[PDB]
Amino acid sequence: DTSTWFITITSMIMTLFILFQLKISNYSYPASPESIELKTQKHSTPWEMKWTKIYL
Amino acid sequence: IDLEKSQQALVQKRHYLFDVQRNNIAMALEVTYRERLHRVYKEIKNRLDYHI
């Protein structure tokens, strides 16, 4: 109850923070998916500008 | 599509205007030869008009 002596649990808590940093590290953010559509637009526009400079 | 026609647009443009430069200078020698045959009649018409 008023328990005692403490040599227990606290060494078994930091092994747990090797688990939770393994699972939650492999998550996906919805926002990152909206960023890859932006750089694809500017690249072909500059490639068309490279084709416009191939005209001009 | 728009950059495929951008190839072909400059190859019908260039061959038209590079023959306009052929014929814009071609008229420059006819009108200076036609006025060469005409002027040599004009200064011999002055002597055909003076002595009368």
Coordinates of C-alpha atoms in Angstrom, one line a residue:
Chain A
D1 CA 0.0 0.0 0.0
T2 CA 2.2 2.8 1.4
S3 CA 4.4 0.7 -0.7
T4 CA 8.2 0.8 -0.1
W5 CA 11.7 0.6 -1.3
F6 CA 11.3 1.4 -5.1
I7 CA 13.9 -0.8 -6.8
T8 CA 11.1 -2.1 -8.9
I9 CA 9.0 -0.6 -11.7
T10 CA 11.1 2.3 -12.8
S11 CA 13.7 0.2 -14.7
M12 CA 10.8 -1.4 -16.5
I13 CA 9.4 1.9 -17.7
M14 CA 12.2 2.9 -20.0
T15 CA 12.1 -0.4 -21.8
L16 CA 8.5 0.6 -22.6
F17 CA 9.7 3.8 -24.3
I18 CA 11.5 1.7 -26.8
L19 CA 8.2 0.2 -27.8
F20 CA 6.1 3.3 -28.1
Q21 CA 8.7 5.1 -30.1
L22 CA 8.6 2.1 -32.5
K23 CA 4.9 1.9 -33.2
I24 CA 3.9 5.6 -33.3
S25 CA 6.9 6.4 -35.4
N26 CA 5.3 4.7 -38.4
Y27 CA 2.3 6.9 -38.8
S28 CA 1.1 8.9 -41.8
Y29 CA 0.2 12.6 -42.0
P30 CA -2.5 13.7 -44.3
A31 CA -0.8 17.1 -44.8
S32 CA 2.4 15.7 -46.3
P33 CA 0.3 14.3 -49.2
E34 CA -0.8 17.8 -50.2
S35 CA 2.8 19.0 -50.5
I36 CA 4.0 16.6 -53.2
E37 CA 1.3 17.9 -55.6
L38 CA 2.9 21.4 -55.4
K39 CA 6.4 20.6 -56.6
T40 CA 5.1 18.5 -59.5
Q41 CA 3.3 21.5 -60.9
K42 CA 6.3 23.9 -60.8
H43 CA 8.7 21.4 -62.3
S44 CA 6.8 20.7 -65.6
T45 CA 5.9 24.5 -65.8
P46 CA 9.7 25.2 -65.7
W47 CA 10.1 22.3 -68.1
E48 CA 7.6 24.0 -70.4
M49 CA 9.6 27.2 -69.8
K50 CA 12.6 25.1 -70.8
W51 CA 10.5 24.2 -73.9
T52 CA 9.5 27.8 -74.3
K53 CA 13.1 28.8 -74.2
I54 CA 13.6 26.0 -76.7
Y55 CA 11.3 28.0 -78.8
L56 CA 12.5 31.5 -77.8
Chain B
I1 CA 0.3 18.3 -77.0
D2 CA 1.0 22.0 -76.6
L3 CA 4.8 21.5 -76.7
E4 CA 4.6 19.1 -79.7
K5 CA 3.0 21.9 -81.8
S6 CA 5.5 24.3 -80.4
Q7 CA 8.1 22.4 -82.4
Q8 CA 6.2 22.6 -85.7
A9 CA 5.1 26.2 -85.2
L10 CA 8.7 27.5 -85.6
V11 CA 9.5 25.5 -88.7
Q12 CA 6.6 26.9 -90.8
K13 CA 7.3 30.4 -89.4
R14 CA 11.0 30.4 -90.3
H15 CA 10.8 29.2 -93.9
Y16 CA 8.1 31.7 -94.8
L17 CA 10.0 34.7 -93.5
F18 CA 13.4 33.5 -94.8
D19 CA 12.0 33.7 -98.3
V20 CA 10.3 37.0 -97.7
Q21 CA 13.9 38.3 -97.2
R22 CA 14.7 36.8 -100.5
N23 CA 11.9 38.6 -102.3
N24 CA 12.0 41.9 -100.4
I25 CA 15.5 42.4 -101.8
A26 CA 14.5 41.0 -105.2
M27 CA 12.1 43.9 -105.8
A28 CA 14.9 46.3 -104.8
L29 CA 16.9 45.4 -107.9
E30 CA 14.0 45.5 -110.4
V31 CA 12.8 49.0 -109.5
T32 CA 16.4 50.2 -109.7
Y33 CA 16.9 48.6 -113.1
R34 CA 13.5 49.7 -114.5
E35 CA 14.4 53.2 -113.4
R36 CA 17.8 52.8 -115.1
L37 CA 16.2 52.0 -118.5
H38 CA 13.7 54.8 -118.0
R39 CA 16.1 57.6 -116.9
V40 CA 18.4 57.1 -119.9
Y41 CA 15.4 57.8 -122.1
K42 CA 14.6 60.9 -120.1
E43 CA 17.9 62.7 -120.5
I44 CA 17.9 62.0 -124.2
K45 CA 14.3 63.3 -124.5
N46 CA 15.6 66.7 -123.1
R47 CA 17.8 67.1 -126.1
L48 CA 14.9 66.0 -128.4
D49 CA 12.9 68.8 -126.8
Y50 CA 15.5 71.5 -126.5
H51 CA 16.7 72.1 -130.1
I52 CA 13.1 72.3 -131.4

